[model samples]
Target chain A: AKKLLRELNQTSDLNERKMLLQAKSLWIDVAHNTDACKNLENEISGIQQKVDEVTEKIRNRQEKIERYTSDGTTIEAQIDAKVIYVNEKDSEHQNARELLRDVKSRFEKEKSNQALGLKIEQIAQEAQPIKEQYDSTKLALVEAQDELQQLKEDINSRQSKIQKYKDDTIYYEDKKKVYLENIKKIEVNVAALKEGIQRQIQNACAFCSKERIENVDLPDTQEEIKRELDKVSRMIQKAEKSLGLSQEEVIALFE
Target chain B: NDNPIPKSVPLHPKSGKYFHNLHARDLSNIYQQCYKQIDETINQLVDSTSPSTIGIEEQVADITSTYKLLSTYESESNSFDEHIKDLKKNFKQSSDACPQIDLSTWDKYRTGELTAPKLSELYLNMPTPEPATMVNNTDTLKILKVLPYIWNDPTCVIPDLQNPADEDDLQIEGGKIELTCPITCKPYEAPLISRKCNHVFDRDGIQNYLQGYTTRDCPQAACSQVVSMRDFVRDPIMELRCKIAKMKESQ
Candidate 1:
């Protein structure tokens, strides 16, 4: 009763709790039956031994009678035959009675004690189907726990990878920003050089009063100046695009 | 090569030796060198990149295989778990299904079936023989004897070859012949014999002999009778002798 109470308190499901209680009762019954059977077999064995001893004596007496008769010893044969019959009757009756007692004892013991054990086994077998349901549910519970654990692990791993990718992306952005600043500095230097080159060209033209240097033919100076200016502009645009910075911001880098 | 006339520019085909030479363009060699260097670097980068990518893929493949194996194991374990549960449940039900006996049935088994007290009484009434206390201290070595009458074959002498024959053939004096075993139409090797009577016969022979004697008799040769297996278990000396003879026959 106390054990049943304890199982009930611990068990959450109705089915498992019932199985636990039933199993406990059946186990005790089986134990009792087994003990009874063992005792009966022991008692029966003891009686059977006595029956065997007595029967052997009767057989010996009969053999003696046969031997005397075969030898043609009439007086001895008569005496041995009479003695043999008496011994046979007595021993045979006693041994038979003893054997009867042994059989009855063994049968009764087996029928009662061993029968109980067999009965218990049968009952247990019948209860097994219901008990199986409880076990299957327990197994399912374990599987659910395992699946939950795996999902948690995957979630942690994905979170870590995402964080790492974000960090590296930040690093790349910083490096590109620095590269854009260096390009801006080069743009500023080229712009200053262009201004100086234009001044020199003006002086060489004699401030617009110098006769076209006859047939000296300055090598398409206008087109050359335009091309050089366009080169500097394109450089600024390339720097702006590389850093994800605006062209205005790139100009500030030059300043 | 001296420049005169203010280094006058020549417009015609006739030329002035201006001694002006610009550095020759050798950019083809520089371009080729740069191309070679870039190609080498790119090849190295591609070669290294492919293997590293493949290595990552292989690592992922290993993880996949591991996962597959683990999943298979998990599935198999789950299956076993179900199987075990079913077994346990069935076992429990069987335990519960045992038919209960009423008091009458129990009594019938006790009195009519087993008769425990009667069995006990028979045991008490039974006579036990005294143990063989007299030791034969004779110095003369008795020869080992074989029961040739039983075996009936000359081959039976082979077992007795190791020992010499005894003065009396080692036959016990006044020994009673109890037909504990039955005489079979066919003879068997090493039939069970009665220790007291030294009578030997086959099992069927003994069973037939005991048919009218009692419900159960000694399974020894002298009785020529059948004994219940239960009684056979109880008779220690008879059982022992029978077992020994059986073992010898097997060998």
Candidate 2:
């Protein structure tokens, strides 16, 4: 009977050990599940923070661009005035060149005719008309020449100023590309982060055999996220450091 | 009207001495220099002792000189003083007319009868205060809530040393304390260590515990042997020494 009782005690000990092992195994599963869930949640939150930061930066950059674009009005008006002056100068130069060419051609032709020893009356008659025409053409050429020189000077000065404006526009365009790149990178990062988070969540919850989760809402808070972006936009507006190039347009000036 | 032309006066009491003293000799000199020039010119138009021309000239010269003196003085004195006086008077009136709020009473309302919402509403309704007054009255109150920590915190009181040791009561020598990882003696602390396991403590402890076992063992697994002196002296969270030191200094 003593041996029987000893055997029974050994059997109970074995059973208890088996039960503890089973419980330990269950606990390990629970811990693993919790860890996976927490890791995914952390990753999601981290990516969300990064997206928010980038969005805010982009918004700020956009506002600065808007301000710079708006403030360009004064420079634009000056450019317009310069453009008009250049056009007027160009017209005056053309008129001067035409008069000079006509006067030179007529003088050369009349001299050639005189060298042929034509009749004196004919020569005198022709010379009278030629001289009159030459004098009038010469005066016109001189006036045109003066205006042409002045126009050339005017064109040089205006072109230098216009070139400065063009440089600024080019700089604005380059900065706008940076802003565009930033926006695109943020969009890609946000997409990748979202996908990673979702995949992690699905993998974590795959074996969660329990009561079905009802109305399991996730924290999106896109508006709250946008607040930082809006704030950055406002900052850019106040600072006046944004680019304002359009989606696909080019600016040029005529020679 | 045959009223003798009244002597013209200087507009300013501080005008030149010629105008101030109106002496007969000075008058005669001025008449000879200025009025006589006019009379001589008029004489050319007529005869020298013609009663009509001489009488007219003398009277006219006297009146003209008086008019010139008075007008010049008036232009200098009257306009400037009148403008400045008017500006000062108007400025004073405007300053007095500006509304004032009783801040002491408002503070009483804020602390006692008024709730935060009510106080905020009242503040919104109050006229905008002068910049100096606003800073003194409003900004100072906001700063009071955060300044005490700077004065009383241990970090501020004793610079550089986080936990200056106490001499009595389980006396800890500040530099004597050491820590090490259960697994590796790599020097690390706080945020780097896993909170779940004390496996990754700092390397400052190994010098005292180095004599024992070559194979690293968990503190939780070790039995019968008392906890290492370092663990006993320092808390698991590592805040014990610092807290005790702070308390002792306060006393």
Candidate 3:
């Protein structure tokens, strides 16, 4: 009985694995069948169909390229305007920086009258005589110091904005270049398809003209191909829908 | 009473003549792995070769034709010929998906709500989920990803990280997510998108990611927004995209 139990379990696993595979196998069968139909479909699509397809790809990309390129141009003027603004502000910031020096030195002379804002705190021993004079003169230089700090912040904001615009423009330009790269890639695809279509044509003609024992009965006409193409496409479609349900059911399992 | 006369089963399915001999989850594993591997590979190839708007086709064709022409120009074609043949085989387009039966029984079987034999038998008439596809036989099925188009680029520049996702469990509203969930790189399940960054995430997954931290940047690549558990809201669109992509796999 124990022997019977062990062997049955082995058989059960083998069978169970086989069962799971049955689902995958269904798709495998569908795929295999459609691959055949697609080969026919591709043959029918041929050189001209492929050319139209590539041409359409070119047109789609150019449409997008035009927009990005035009958008890129719009940003150029904005970029220049911001550039001039930053230049103007930078000079103001520089002037503020120098003003603090000029103002503080003159105020330093009054504090040599014992009046300077920074030194006033340190020289408290003689505080009484120049105290009010130092305090009054202190405010004069403070004004320049404040302007420098404030304008520096303004400059920073302007600089950061310019950088953001620079990055944005680079992205736009990079994208256009990539599409242009992809377009020439169309050149590559077309050339190969030409070679491939040419190679395949010779093979078909040689065999059909020979028409010997190798046996070539594949359809030569579009309608004969279309019937099976449409049929197989339908088959693949149902399989896809069924596959979707199976996957959703998998999701359902976790819940 | 040492073993207590053994009314229950073991970790495996070989327990009592069938599903009875197995743990419920173990039985589920067979079903899951069997179908999962097949679906994964098929989806890779099909998605790679998917019939639709094109990008990498041109990119891939560029390399492929260059190789083909190089080999031809040399009459030394076989060296590159081998490469091209390998490329064609490795990169062929297609799909592999399976039917889903109510797996409700799978967990049930684990919990004793189902008998293993019952589920095993239920699976018998169904199509087999291959342990591997021919693509699988090329062996591990790992190398296919060589190039990317800009729309789905992986190498884009990323901002620095460090974000806290939510402020008040602020339920994010109305955003779409990438096809694969950022955290798990799995397809969406119980999707939640962040209001702060307007990015989508898997609900349970994002929760798992945000837990134990006050906040974190959105798990998505290059995203800089901070979010917390309260930050996410639901999107029917996330699930919709996952299901929609499955349909597009064929055409």
Candidate 4:
């Protein structure tokens, strides 16, 4: 029985070694499966991450391209406006310069046409001496006309004095003729009276012869009458001497 | 019989008799149960006899209980050895009658030879589809070649076209086209104009300095007027003119 127990113990050891070997082989197969699954999972995740990153990059690039294209359109419009402004400014400058040249030319032409200084000087020099001569001659002619009027007034005063002296001489000659004629008439009347006295004495003698006795007294009166006659004749001679001119001469003077 | 030795019972020579029969699997099970019972008994003996701190009297009692368990373990181990001897004898006799198993194919499966069928069926068997429209690849290449002429390059070295003596030229001169930002003293790319002051500068150069305050004086030396964000606008006309002028110079 002891020998049999020793033999059985050896057999049990062999069986345990076989079971351990089988279990080790199965574990190796499970480990290989686990490794394969892990490798496939890592590959899938890596590829997915790369695809997502590329898609995001495309979206960003598209947005940038659109912005650049819009900017180009805006630039074209700005260039058009600038060209128009440059043309307008150039035309304005040209017009201003032309207008300046026209105004300057007109001013120069007007200045040359008016030569007023020499004409005004010549007119003042020619009029000065003639105006001085006319003033002196007009004063001398007024003085000569005043002297001729004074001499005409003196000749009229002397003619009026001579006519007054002739009228006084004719009145004195007429008075002298009237005095001589009155003396002649007185002499004649005295002679006639003497003769009548003589006659009357002779008649007284005749009457005595006729009448016889007539008185004889006549001789004394005759002598007395002759004496009285002689006295009367003397008075007539005195009157004649007093009359210087005849009475006819005196009457002619009165007429 | 009085000697306490068990007496054997003999069968009659001419009578027919049947005894109890057990299979090899039943014997293997019994052999396994014997090994488990022996292991349990030995574990109980080891637990009772292991070192511990106790009173002298408790030590003696523990030793007594440990001695009893040790005897029970020896008896179970002896019985398991008796069953193993019988099973070995029976297995030796049956070994000559059974056929040998071949395990080489199972070893090949363990090394990954059986994976092709599942991989093709699950992953590699799909139809190829066509695209909706054809693409002209040359057109895209031509567009890429012409793109540089249309847009300005940031890294390009721009020419300095400004001549100080030509300031009075009425027409747009090279000097006017090459105007620089006063703040940064660099050529203006995206030029911006101040509406209030009418002064121009590069958009980034002026905005960067101006952003620090709510209101600021115009950056140009000739202008001192106050300006704000509202006073600024993109001067695209001036920017495009400058770009064209620089491009002509580069050519």
Query: lDDT scores for all predictions?
Result: 0.40, 0.41, 0.45, 0.40
In model 2 chain A, which range of ten residues has the least summed lDDT?
A246-255
Candidate 1 lDDT, B1-251, residue by residue in tens: 23222211111111101111111222343444444554344333322333112233343344335434543444444444454444434433432243223455444443444221222233355344322342322111011112212222212222233345632355423343232323444434334544343334455555565566665555433246444322321222233233334444564
- Please, what are the lDDT tens digits per residue for candidate 1 over residues A1-255? 444434333332433333333333333333344455456546445544544444454455445435534543454455456555544654554555555556556556656676467655565565454346445544555455455445434433333333333333443444445544554564565456555545544454543222333323323344553554465455544544554545343445544
Tens-digit per-residue lDDT, A50-156, candidate 2:
65665566566556545545544554565566556555654555555555566556656767666643554565565565556555655665565466545544544
Residue B59 in model 2: shift from native, Å? Answer: 91
Error of 1 at B169 (Å): 99
TM-score of 4: 0.17
Q: Give me the runs in candidate 4 sitting further than 4 Å from their true place.
A: A1-40, A93-255, B1-251
Q: Considering only chain A, what is the TM-score of each predicted structure?
A: 0.31, 0.30, 0.30, 0.27
Name every residue pair that clashes in candidate 4: none
Per-residue C-alpha lDDT of model 3 across residues A92-199, encoded as one tens digit per residue: 554555555555655566678862665655544444445444444455445544554445444444343343334334444555566557556655665666566555
Query: Which residue pairs show backbone clashes in model 2?
Result: A60-A232, A64-A242, A65-A242, A65-A243, B178-B204, B178-B205, B179-B204, B179-B205, B180-B202
| Number of clashing residue pairs, candidate 2 | 9
Q: Which regions in candidate 1 have their CA more than 4 angstroms from the true location?
A: A1-126, A201-255, B1-251
Interface Cα RMSD per model, in Å? Answer: 33.1, 30.2, 31.5, 99.9
The local lDDT score (0 to 100) that residue B43 gets in candidate 1 is 31
lDDT (0-100) at residue A19 of candidate 4? 30
The segments of candidate 3 whose C-alpha lies over 4 angstroms from its true place after superposition are A1-49, A115-255, B1-251
